[PDB]
Design a protein around this ligand. Structure first.
Ligand SMILES: [Cu+2]
Ligand SMILES: [Cu+2]
Length: 143
């Protein structure tokens, strides 16, 4: 909160998307069985640890606003480029899928401290192309 007379910047650089890695996922709604299928494929270019080292990445996958237990991939130890190759299934009728949002969040597993989040992104069900399998890389967003 100031007139903003001094400051420099930098401000534009600070607004850019940080290099927090990317996640490849696939998505398909199975109309025969009435379930949403999500493929957590692989992540790339996860950030190196502050003073060198690699993280122990895993991915949490869940639907908002649903409050059911989130799914999680296995933990891949010491790698910034894990290949998960896992599929998760959400038994939800298509009619109920409308206002829901799929979230994929990559964490750094640690046995002795809270797991740091690496980054995340969201997929609103209302902008998903239900007629074809969806597959894409998404840059992980801060927070
Ligand atoms: Cu096609
Ligand atoms: Cu088509």
């Amino acid at each position: 909160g100031s007139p903003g007379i001094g400051g420099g910047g930098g401000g534009i650089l600070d607004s850019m998307v940080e290099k927090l890695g990317k996640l490849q996922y696939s998505l398909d709604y199975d109309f025969q069985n009435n379930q949403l299928l999500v493929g957590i494929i692989q992540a790339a270019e996860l950030p190196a640890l502050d003073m060198g080292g690699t993280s122990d990445p895993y991915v949490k996958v869940f639907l908002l606003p649903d409050k059911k237990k989130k799914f999680e991939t296995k933990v891949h130890r010491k790698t910034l480029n894990p290949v998960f190759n896992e599929q998760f299934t959400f038994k939800v009728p298509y009619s109920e899928l409308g206002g829901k949002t799929l979230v994929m969040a990559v964490y750094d597993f640690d046995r002795f401290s809270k797991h740091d989040i690496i980054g995340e992104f969201k997929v609103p069900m209302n902008t998903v192309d239900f007629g074809h399998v969806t597959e894409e890389w998404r840059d992980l967003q801060s927070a």
